[PDB]
Write a protein that binds this ligand. Structure first.
Ligand SMILES: Nc1nc2c(ncn2[C@@H]2O[C@H](COP(=O)(O)OP(=O)(O)O)[C@@H](O)[C@H]2O)c(=O)[nH]1
Ligand SMILES: [Mg+2]
Length: 167
């Protein structure tokens, strides 16, 4: 079976772990905070093709890890996650995308931009159009808003990332 090495990136507290665990294990972490950078495995079918996914759930961009450039070089596709309730987490993604492009030395890198915590619409500070606009600037043709808590678009993040990889 074809294996896909996916990497989930973004600033602290946006729901990287929550999205990864909801996808792979089908449960919501609540307050559980892995802070090991573990890999999680799940087999799926995307567009009638069997896929074995390995998903690396990274620590926040703010935090120490001696493995970041390695993660970026070796990752086949990247989910760049922000929270719709924190503008800083959205703006932080611009530098992380640039770091990936620098390491890969190319602009053509499978990526999905993800605005998480859509269930906190009442606390939204990042517009959906702003997210759509950032993906546009990246010439990236995949953008989603999600909720790890409400299970909205969780599977679709990873399915769409697989699609960007095997386009
Ligand atoms: N309301 C809501 N809370 C979320 C969501 N995703 C994560 N959380 C919560 O936000 C906090 C941080 O989540 P976590 O997965 O640890 O973020 P990480 O630092 O990016 O790995 C936790 O309290 C989570 O329960 C979501 O989609 N909706
Ligand atoms: Mg985490």
């Amino acid at each position: 079976m074809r294996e896909y090495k996916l990497v989930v990136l973004g600033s602290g507290g946006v729901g990287k772990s929550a999205l990864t665990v909801q996808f792979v294990q089908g449960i919501f972490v609540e307050k559980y905070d892995p802070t090991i950078e573990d890999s999680y495995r799940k087999q799926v079918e995307v567009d009638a093709q069997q896929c074995m996914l390995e998903i690396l759930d990274t620590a926040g961009t703010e935090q120490f890890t001696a493995m970041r450039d390695l993660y970026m070089k070796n990752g086949q596709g990247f989910a760049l996650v922000y929270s719709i309730t924190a503008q800083s987490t959205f703006n932080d993604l611009q530098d992380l995308r640039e770091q990936i492009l620098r390491v890969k030395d190319t602009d053509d890198v499978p990526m999905i931009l993800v605005g998480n915590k859509c269930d906190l619409e009442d606390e939204r500070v990042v517009g959906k159009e702003q997210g759509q606009n950032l993906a546009r600037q990246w010439s990236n043709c995949a953008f989603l808003e999600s909720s790890a808590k409400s299970k909205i678009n969780v599977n679709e993040i990873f399915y769409d990332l697989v699609r960007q990889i095997n386009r």
